[PDB]
Amino acid sequence: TTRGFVFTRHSQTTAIPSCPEGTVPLYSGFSFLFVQGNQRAHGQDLGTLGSCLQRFTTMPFLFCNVNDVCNFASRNDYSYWLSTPALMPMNMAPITGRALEPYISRCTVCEGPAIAIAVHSQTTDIPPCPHGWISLWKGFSFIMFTSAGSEGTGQALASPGSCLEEFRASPFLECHGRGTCNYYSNSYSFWLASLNPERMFRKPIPSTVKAGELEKIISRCQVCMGTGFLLVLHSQTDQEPTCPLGMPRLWTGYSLLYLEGQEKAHNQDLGLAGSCLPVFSTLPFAYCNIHQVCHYAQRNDRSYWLASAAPLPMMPLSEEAIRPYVSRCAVCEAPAQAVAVHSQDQSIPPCPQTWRSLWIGYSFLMHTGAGDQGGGQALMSPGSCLEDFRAAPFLECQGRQGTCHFFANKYSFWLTTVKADLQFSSAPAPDTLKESQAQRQKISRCQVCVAPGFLITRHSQTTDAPQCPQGTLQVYEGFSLLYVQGNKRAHGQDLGTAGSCLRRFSTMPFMFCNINNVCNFASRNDYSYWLSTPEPMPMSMQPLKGQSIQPFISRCAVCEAPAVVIAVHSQTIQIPHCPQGWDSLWIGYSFMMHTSAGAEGSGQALASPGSCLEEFRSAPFIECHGRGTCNYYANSYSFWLATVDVSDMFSKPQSETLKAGDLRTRISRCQVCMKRT
Amino acid sequence: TTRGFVFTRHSQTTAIPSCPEGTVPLYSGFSFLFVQGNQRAHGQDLGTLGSCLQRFTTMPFLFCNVNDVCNFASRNDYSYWLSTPALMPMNMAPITGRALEPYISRCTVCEGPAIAIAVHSQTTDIPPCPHGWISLWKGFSFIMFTSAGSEGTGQALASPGSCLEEFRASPFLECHGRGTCNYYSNSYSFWLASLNPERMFRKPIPSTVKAGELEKIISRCQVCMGTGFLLVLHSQTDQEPTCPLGMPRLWTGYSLLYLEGQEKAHNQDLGLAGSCLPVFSTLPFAYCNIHQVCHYAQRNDRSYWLASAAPLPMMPLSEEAIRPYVSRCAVCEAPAQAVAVHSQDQSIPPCPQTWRSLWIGYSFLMHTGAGDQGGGQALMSPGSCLEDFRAAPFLECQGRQGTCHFFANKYSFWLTTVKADLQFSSAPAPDTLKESQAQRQKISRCQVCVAPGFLITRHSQTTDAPQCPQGTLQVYEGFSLLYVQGNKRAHGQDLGTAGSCLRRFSTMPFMFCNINNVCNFASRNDYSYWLSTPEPMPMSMQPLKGQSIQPFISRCAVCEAPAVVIAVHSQTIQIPHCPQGWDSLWIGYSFMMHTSAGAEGSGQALASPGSCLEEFRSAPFIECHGRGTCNYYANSYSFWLATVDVSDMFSKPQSETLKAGDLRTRISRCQVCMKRT
Ligand SMILES: [Cl-]
Ligand SMILES: [Cl-]
Ligand SMILES: [Cl-]
Ligand SMILES: [Cl-]
Ligand SMILES: [Cl-]
Ligand SMILES: [Cl-]
Ligand SMILES: [Cl-]
Ligand SMILES: [Cl-]
Ligand SMILES: [Cl-]
Ligand SMILES: [Cl-]
Ligand SMILES: [Cl-]
Ligand SMILES: [Cl-]
């Protein structure tokens, strides 16, 4: 019955969890939440296999530099794991060694015949599964978390990872490269709140709860399995959108862009059903601390939503005045996966023949709100294809104040057109565009299409386009885009997805727009980052410009596969076996995250082929700028999953500095696998 | 007896503190710690008059945008105040309204005949004052603090503000524009630790203490008054420097650059005695939480120190191996204040005649270490003039690990030479310099001189240089530098100091250097920011380049004054009176901080003339880039101290959005005053 749809279940105890009825176990492990390296957090969604590591260690990664030197457990980095209810020592000492085992949650990776999703009631009642869908488990609506330095990450709200079966004010441990784990007083968990749906557009009522009553303010959820895929539509108006003909509507709601707790953004991809919340609030979440206290509407947190085209307000909108400004959404049951295609051109890109066209739009890439926070869309996701271009596509809600507003620091970023024959030859030509039609003519266009198969991306890490893996068919060739950085905020593209493969290269493939309806292209200090090749730097070590950039940029192919493709990781020097019933596509090294300018960066999902780079490189990417230059920089860092022998589990990490020939002895291996059908 | 040397004393109770014997009170108020606006913290040193505000409110500032609109208490910003021992409600409810009064510490601003400094024992014993100096009070060694989003700030370690008379695990309250204040579980205080001086170069011993024993790990201090000024020397070698002839040596130590707690840097200016710590440690501090628990060496914090010229290590230096790599320092008693003069030229700038020359060096501007953290030097401070140029002038110590190392992401930033006759005409010419002599020839030179008077800076906010205020003499004219941003990290120059007045303009007045001994100028994506003029943007709204930049840049004058100059702020629409015995220099508006790209920014000290801008402007500064462009941007924000009527004190801030004609009705006024002699 199984067809390659893989999810994780977490016990939150020392017990290894059983797979739900109708699904089969692939392997079990320890519940891995996120890493924090060079002050940057990078997580693995709890519903995906990347959150289940077979080998526990307080330091599951290492980092490498442009001098071809790697450092393991030798600086001041962190890892975080879901915990059990085991009580900590009374003297508040940390735990080390094998004594850690009773404290770490266990997990099991399961394969099912169809996708598993989470649905949330946003009340204290358990929501029903969508009609026809089968219940896998019930739980509590878990969103995000922060710990050291207020760094953290979150769950996609339609992922099973957003539905924890046991409520915990303190669901996770902070661990150090030093070998210790503990709970700390700034370790915070964030949950969807139980809301009054009649008060959507009214000021939140503050509440503080203590042990014995914490669950009275927490939303409930179910994880459900049903055939088909989820298609998400955002109207960008105050009217609910209608589903494509033949696709049943599962629910409607309000277009959630991101939530911000303790000044840390947690975004929902607009193409995923977690971006469609049935119950709006200026503050749809609460947070809890390790002292078994939860606070709702007691500090300074906020929310961000896609906006309608109602006229810009001159001052914050209060309570009921908010309603006409929030975009609506629908979640529809589709027979296959929808993807966005982008042209980097004024012309609308056609859907491949036999692929059903759903809508056409403009290429929406990323956004920044208050502070240095923001987020962005996956270019392979329909959430990157908005039917209506808007310089100001989103609003901010001031949480407790019960208002929303468009403040002047809001930026939207859009993929731009690129002249096909001028690639490399010239620097981006800066421009400032003040009229909406002028702007629309410089923005990349897109079309959302239903694909009969699955798309994966492969990167050659050379100047030659790679071949697709056995049994797949090349769709197009391109250039390996790793991430972009706009207004200092980094936003990545999953290297296993088509957004990491742009058909046209530019050092500045996007522009930004403000609430004054003025857009600026290549006119500030922004970046693009690309996987790179073995090409050595010039002896002068000056940045490359123009045609001299070409030999440095990795190429890629997007490949059409007949079945689902995943990556698995051994955490050893051995190649991990593909799960039974899956066939090998390629092998590689476990690539997890990266940072460069301002220590901003992004990372890979371990479940994705993008986490399995076929050639290890201490310096796998090059940094480009809107002014038309590219170079390597001394603070460009790569992060890799580490090997963990049985003797490395639980014990103090053996800190080490490794030079060139001895690097890959500590790098985990991986295999990219495709379900056999 | 008084001669214009002004400091603050804090009671940490509801009692208004008396001034120490031999000093006279100027006014009293409430103990103000820092603001957090647009996710950026900006503090007022607790030893300075900026930490004593007469009118308490939970929202003492507002912010303004490039559309000439200001917003007061309408977003999600914070203020922080020193607290009393008053107990909070049992249900953990926040406090609002007049009920806040018993919780806010009081302060008194005092004038004395000479400077007041803090000295720290780094033990549980009280240190003696330097020989001949008079004790003002005793206390506990307070460094820094973090709260929401792990934002916070710190005290200069030779400031009286680093010596709190009562130890408190929870010394401060977090307040909101909403009108609430409370303690939160992530509100952390950081203190110098009690250290074993025999274990300076050994691994820290971890400790966790609870109520009743917290002070057993906390350093003690005294605040002392003595005639003369402090001169700080850094050898950049493992040998202690010798004081200039005629200047008694007060102490020697190790060159502290910055400390990092919860991933937040707190820097010590290298020209201030807080950068010279007698007792080295890889972790010289501990932290406490509001649950009356303090932790030493239990997490992942670190320290940074100036380095010697010993050869670069291939792996971290462990314990005793550290010693030859840490720079030494001396603190000397000087008869007048020493300042740095910079040439922006290969030629050494001469000391003004009659000013005593102390040393010559290279212009050291800023630095970045792990993550997005770092700091920098005031160009008027001798700490910006290092005798030996070093691409890698500082090292990082990994705290608990008991190691130090030079990792590849470390950057040093140096002020560069500027061709006098090429200003404005051409964009900066990018260059990559790989040889030390080549680098030294592109770096600005400096000389440290003893000045017989005091220097202040005035900004015209027009294209004309301003006149110096009455009774002062112009030293030079220049361009108004507000701050720089390198590797995304912002670093400001106090607008009341000569570092905010550069004789030569460039959009890129600095370069950066890495541990591979390679320096890069105008070759990445860095910024400079300048006070601006009334010049309107071009209709195209494209960035300015070349000679078109000139009409946008504010000019300044540096002025020599016969006596100390301060600013005072009314928090009302009325001009504050100068203190008795002080004469008026100019009046203005209370300018506190600013942010632009990435919401990075800097701010002003309320004690400084730099916090008193003579013309209010919603958009007082323009953003320039290393590529040679300048423009205004929609996220360029200014922050101003707000007016607080008696009816605004304690009560809920009356949130308001203000347009152009009604802006200054909510802007505090100020006066710049000079001691009459
Ligand atoms: Cl580490
Ligand atoms: Cl803690
Ligand atoms: Cl809140
Ligand atoms: Cl604004
Ligand atoms: Cl740019
Ligand atoms: Cl570099
Ligand atoms: Cl506010
Ligand atoms: Cl809390
Ligand atoms: Cl620590
Ligand atoms: Cl490194
Ligand atoms: Cl630059
Ligand atoms: Cl802008």
Author numbering:
A (entry chain A), B (entry chain A): 2 to 678
Question: What text comes from the article?
Answer:
The collagen IVα345 scaffold, composed of the α3, α4, and α5 chains, is a major constituent of the GBM. The crystal structure of the hexamer revealed a ring of 12 chloride ions that, together with up to six sulfilimine bonds, stabilizes the hexamer structure. The α345 hexamer harbors a number of structural features associated with pathology, which are located within the LCL sites where pathogenic mechanisms of AS and GP converge, and potentially DN.
The single-chain α345 NC1 trimer produced recombinantly in stably transfected HEK293 cells was purified to homogeneity and crystallized in the presence of sodium chloride. The crystal structure was solved at the 1.76 Å resolution with a single polypeptide chain per asymmetric unit. It has the designed orientation of α chains in the order of α3-to-α4-to-α5. The atomic structure is homologous to the crystal structure of the α121 NC1 domain, which is also homologous to all reported crystal structures of tissue extracted from the human and bovine α121 NC1 domain. Based on sulfilimine cross-linking analysis of the GBM α345 hexamer, the expected chain pairs were α3–α5 and α4–α4 (7), although in the crystal structure, we observed α3–α3 and α4–α5 pairs. Thus, the present crystal structure of the α345 hexamer demonstrates a labile nature of a trimer–trimer orientation in the hexamer before sulfilimine cross-linking. Despite rotational mismatch of the crystallized hexamer, we discovered a set of twelve Cl- ions at the trimer–trimer interface having the same geometry as in the α121 hexamer. Geometry and residue specificity of Cl- coordination are identical between α345 and α121, with only one exception, that is, two-thirds of group 1 ions (four ions per hexamer) are not coordinated by the salt bridge to the arginine residue of the opposite trimer, rather identical arginine within the same trimer coordinates respective ions (Cl- ions #1–2). The central inner cavity going from one trimer to another through the hexamer interface accommodates multiple structured PEG molecules but would accommodate much larger molecules if present during protein folding or the hexamer assembly.
